[PDB]
Design a protein around this ligand. Structure first.
Ligand SMILES: c1ccc(NCc2cccnc2)cc1
Ligand SMILES: [Yb+3]
Ligand SMILES: [Yb+3]
Ligand SMILES: [Zn+2]
Length: 607
C-alpha cells in the first residue's frame, strides 16, 4: 500500500507508457495539453480506475476516440484530488488501452516554479523548472503517482521559439510549431521504465557545453564557463560508478545548473541531473553532490523504493556509492572523513527532531504525513550508517561492494521494500548469517534516535578539525590572542567546513570568540556555500548582530532548502532579527519556490 497515493495500486492496473503533448504558457503560467496513458489491467473485468491529480483542470478524457465519464473527488490536503475514470469497455487481465486526458496545470502547481525575467541571470526571458520528488508529479499531469509503477515516456513540448525545453529523457529533435510560428516543439524519448517522480522539465534561455564523451552541462549563458569547470570530474565519476554498479543504461549523462531557487542540492532526473548553482564554489570542492546524483542512476533510478516509507533504500545506498566514488578519487582516508562527517549530520538531525521522534526512524510510516515535511538527513545518514556498519561486519568494502553490484543487478527495473532488500542481503551473505543475526534489525530499521551501534571511522583527517574546534570552545578571553590565520594553514576547505560543523554543534560560543574568529580567519570572505552557511549559523546563534544582513542575504539570494530553512529559523530564534526574518519571508513568499515557501512558513509559524 502506497499511503501517499490516491490512485489505483499496481495490483489493479499499471501505467506502461505516457505520451505527453503540451504547451508552456508563460503569460498564464500554465502547462496545457494531453497526457496519453497506456494502461495495462492487472484484474479481470476492470471497469474503472483512479489517478492522482493536484490542482489540475480537466477538460476531458478520451478513450477509443470518444469522451468518457470521470469524476474528481474531494481534495485530501497535500495528496491532491483523486480522479476516477469510467472505462467504456471492461478489460481482461493484461489488456492494455490508451487513455487520453486533456488538462491544464494551476499557476500554483507545487511541482513548478515559474520565474520572471528579473529572477533569471540574463534578465530578458522567463524560466520554468519542475521538481516532482516525492509526490508532485500529480501537480503536473494525471498519473499513478507512486514509485511502485514504472513507465516509459515520450513528450512533445511547445515553447516560445527563443527558449529551450529539456526533460529527463533523450532529446529527439526540434521543429517550428505548426499551430504557432512564434513557437518551437521539442521532442523527447525515455526508453527505460522509470517511476513518475523522475519526470522533469525545464524551459528557459539555455546554452550547453560539452564536458565529457556523454555529458553536456546546461545553464544560462552567464554560468556555462564556471559550470563546465566545476563539474569537469563528471566523466571520471561515471566510470567509477559503472565499475561499482554495472552498465550505465541511460545513454546520456547531462547536467543542468538551475537558478538559485532550486530547492535541493541535486535531483537525479534520468539523462539530465538537476543541480543547485550553490555548487559553484570555483574549486570543484562540492563535487560529492555530482557523485551522489550519478550514483542514483543505479540506486534509486534502476532499483527504486516501492513506497516513500522505504526512501532510505534510495538514499542510503546512494550515499554509500557516493562516498566510494569520492574514496576512489581522493583516497580511503577521505571516504572515512566524509563518513564521520555524515554521522555528525545524523546527530544534528536526531537532536533537532528529538531522539524519540518518528521521523528519526529509518523506515518511516508516512500515513497522513506530507513527505515534504518528513524530509531530512535521516534516510541519507542513518541509511549510510547501516550500510557502513554492515560493510565492517561482513568483511570490508571489497566484499560489501560485491553485494551492492549483485543487489543492483537483482532488482534493476523493479520497485522494492526494505524486506526485499533484507531478504536479498541474507541470501547473498548466507555463509555469514550468524553475523547478520547479531544485528539489532528492529532497532536499526524501526526505532527512533541514533543507531544502536556506531561504526569505526579512521580519524586521520578529522583530528585537526576537532583539535581546533576544542581550542576555540575551551578558550577564555585571555586565550583569544593566540589564534591566528596560520591556524588554517594545512586545512582543506573540507576540513574548514568540518571545523565549523564541530563548533556549531556547541553553539552558541561567546560573542567575543566569534568576533575574534572573523578577525583572524576572515570567514566573511569565503563564498563556498557549505562553509558560509555554517559560519553564518554560528554567528547568528552566538548573537552577532553584524551577521544579520549577511544571513538574510544568503537566505534569500538562493533557495536551497538545506541552507534557506535553517538560516530563516536561526534568524527567527534571535530576538534582534526575529521581526526582520518574518518580514523578509512575507516579502519574498510570492516569488519563492512553492514547496520552500510552504516549509519556511511552517518553520517560522507564519500564516
Ligand atoms: C523528496 C521529498 C520528500 C521525500 N519524503 C519521503 C521521506 C522523507 C524522509 C524519510 N523517509 C521518506 C523524499 C524525497
Ligand atoms: Yb477491487
Ligand atoms: Yb587564562
Ligand atoms: Zn538523493
Amino acid at each position: 500500500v502506497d499511503t501517499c497515493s490516491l490512485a489505483s495500486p499496481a495490483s489493479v492496473c499499471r501505467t506502461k507508457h505516457l505520451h505527453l503533448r503540451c504547451s508552456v504558457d508563460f503569460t498564464r503560467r500554465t502547462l496545457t495539453g494531453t497526457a496519453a496513458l497506456t494502461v495495462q489491467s492487472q484484474e479481470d473485468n476492470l471497469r474503472s480506475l483512479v489517478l492522482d491529480t493536484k490542482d489540475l483542470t480537466i477538460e476531458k478524457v478520451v478513450i477509443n476516440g470518444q469522451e468518457v465519464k470521470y469524476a474528481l473527488g474531494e481534495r485530501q490536503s497535500y495528496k491532491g484530488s483523486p480522479m476516477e475514470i469510467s472505462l467504456p469497455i471492461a478489460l481482461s487481465k493484461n489488456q492494455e488501452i490508451v487513455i487520453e486526458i486533456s488538462f491544464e496545470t494551476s499557476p500554483k502547481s507545487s511541482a513548478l516554479q515559474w520565474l520572471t525575467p528579473e529572477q533569471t541571470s540574463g534578465k530578458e526571458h522567463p524560466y520554468l523548472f519542475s521538481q516532482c520528488q516525492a509526490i508532485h508529479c500529480r501537480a503536473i499531469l494525471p498519473c499513478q503517482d507512486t514509485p511502485s509503477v514504472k513507465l516509459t515516456y515520450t513528450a512533445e513540448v511547445s515553447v516560445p521559439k527563443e527558449l529551450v525545453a529539456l526533460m529527463s529523457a533523450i532529446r529527439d529533435g526540434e521543429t517550428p510549431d505548426p499551430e504557432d510560428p512564434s513557437r518551437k516543439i521539442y521532442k523527447f524519448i525515455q526508453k527505460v521504465p522509470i517511476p513518475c517522480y523522475l519526470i522533469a522539465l525545464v524551459v528557459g534561455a539555455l546554452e550547453s557545453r560539452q564536458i565529457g564523451p556523454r555529458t553536456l552541462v546546461w545553464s544560462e549563458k552567464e554560468q556555462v564557463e564556471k559550470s563546465a569547470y566545476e563539474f569537469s570530474e563528471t566523466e571520471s565519476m561515471l566510470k567509477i560508478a559503472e565499475d561499482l554498479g554495472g552498465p550505465y543504461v541511460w545513454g546520456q549523462y547531462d547536467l543542468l545548473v538551475l537558478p538559485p531557487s532550486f530547492p535541493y542540492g541535486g535531483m537525479e532526473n534520468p539523462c539530465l541531473t538537476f543541480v543547485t548553482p550553490t555548487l559553484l564554489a570555483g574549486d570543484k570542492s562540492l563535487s560529492n553532490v555530482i557523485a551522489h546524483e550519478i550514483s542514483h542512476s543505479w540506486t534509486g533510478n534502476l532499483v527504486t523504493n516501492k513506497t516513500w516509507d522505504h526512501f532510505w533504500l534510495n538514499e542510503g545506498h546512494t550515499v554509500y556509492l557516493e562516498r566510494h566514488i569520492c574514496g576512489r578519487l581522493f583516497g580511503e582516508k577521505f571516504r572515512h572523513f566524509n563518513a564521520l562527517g555524515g554521522w555528525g549530520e545524523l546527530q544534528n538531525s536526531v537532536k533537532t527532531f528529538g531522539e524519540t521522534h518518528p521521523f528519526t526512524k529509518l523506515v518511516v510510516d508516512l500515513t497522513d504525513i506530507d513527505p515534504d515535511v518528513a524530509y531530512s538527513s535521516v534516510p541519507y545518514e542513518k541509511g549510510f550508517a547501516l550500510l557502513f556498519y554492515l560493510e565492517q561486519l561482513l568483511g570490508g568494502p571489497e566484499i560489501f561492494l560485491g553485494f551492492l553490484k549483485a543487489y543492483v543487478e537483482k532488482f534493476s527495473y523493479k520497485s522494492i521494500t526494505t524486506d526485499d532488500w533484507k531478504d536479498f542481503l541474507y541470501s547473498y551473505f548466507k555463509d555469514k548469517v550468524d553475523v547478520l543475526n547479531q544485528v539489532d534489525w528492529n532497532a536499526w530499521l524501526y526505532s527512533p534516535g541514533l543507531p544502536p551501534i556506531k561504526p569505526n571511522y579512521d580519524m586521520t583527517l578529522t583530528n585537526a578539525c576537532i583539535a581546533l574546534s576544542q581550542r576555540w570552545i575551551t578558550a577564555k578571553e585571555d586565550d583569544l590572542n593566540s589564534f591566528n590565520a596560520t591556524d588554517l594553514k594545512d586545512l582543506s576547505s573540507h576540513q574548514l567546513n568540518e571545523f565549523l560543523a564541530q563548533t556549531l554543534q556547541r553553539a552558541p560560543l561567546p560573542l567575543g570568540h566569534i568576533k575574534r574568529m572573523q578577525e583572524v580567519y576572515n570567514f566573511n570572505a569565503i563564498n563556498n556555500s557549505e562553509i558560509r552557511f555554517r559560519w553564518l549559523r554560528l554567528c547568528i546563534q552566538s548573537k552577532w548582530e553584524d551577521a544579520i544582513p549577511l544571513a538574510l542575504k544568503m537566505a534569500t539570494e538562493q533557495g536551497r532548502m538545506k541552507f534557506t530553512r535553517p538560516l530563516f529559523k536561526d534568524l527567527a530564534a534571535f530576538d534582534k532579527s526575529h521581526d526582520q526574518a518574518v518580514r523578509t519571508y512575507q516579502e519574498h513568499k510570492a516569488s519563492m519556490h512553492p514547496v520552500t515557501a510552504m516549509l519556511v512558513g511552517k518553520d517560522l509559524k507564519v500564516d
